[model samples]
Target: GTPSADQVRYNYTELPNGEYCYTPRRRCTSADQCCRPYDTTAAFHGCGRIWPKDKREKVDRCYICNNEKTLCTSVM
Candidate 1:
């Protein structure tokens, strides 16, 4: 089956300390949701960007790089 434009969506949120360029929010109190994510291997959002694509067209995927310090959890 073919995937929709959104089915392979990315979630890249940029932290002030990270080097990925684009981020979720300009200001963050914690690094939990502070970075932008992108595709594992895509034409547009690759490490060195070469584009006919804009951010709106590309999905924000959660890219993990030596991310042992990053963790996501929800508690009730």
Candidate 2:
């Protein structure tokens, strides 16, 4: 099925040392509630951003990069 624009959302909170945690924008609460990079592969080679809730558009998603270490303010 096709996804809605609302369903295809992203938001992140920046932290120290250029680290960050991203969520669906809707589920975002605080840094503790968000996720850090699960692994190096997820950090560098993939967009494996995680949400505390399961109501995500996709697990492996769009162009978020460098895990939680950089801003993905631009899109692919």
Candidate 3:
């Protein structure tokens, strides 16, 4: 099962080096909610890049969203 829009939450941590590191605050029950990396310079939210379900760990500094409209819970 996947999380509904209201159930989704985006969380990130600001590394000492200024990198915005996203960490899943809640376990993603669906693939759509899994975290994926995006270019911080891009104007859009989220990216077209897709990762294997088991490779989610590789997206350490990425963003998670069910849709582009879902903004990160924290920002610079």
Full-model lDDT for every candidate: 0.32, 0.39, 0.37
Q: Write the per-residue lDDT of candidate 2 for residues 1-76, one digit (tens) a residue.
A: 3323322333454655476654423234443444433343534322444343333454443233344444432332
Q: For residues 21-47, what per-residue lDDT tens digits would candidate 1 score against the true structure?
A: 434223233434434334434312223
Model 3 clash pairs?
Answer: none
Off by over 4 Å in 1: 12-45, 52-76
lDDT preference between candidates 1 and 2, better one: 2
TM-score, per-candidate, Cα-based? 0.24, 0.22, 0.22
Local lDDT at 67 for model 2: 41
Best by lDDT: 2
**lDDT ranking of the models:** 2, 3, 1
Global fold similarity of model 3 (TM-score): 0.22
> Model 2, which residues run further than 4 Å from truth?
1-25, 40-64, 67-76
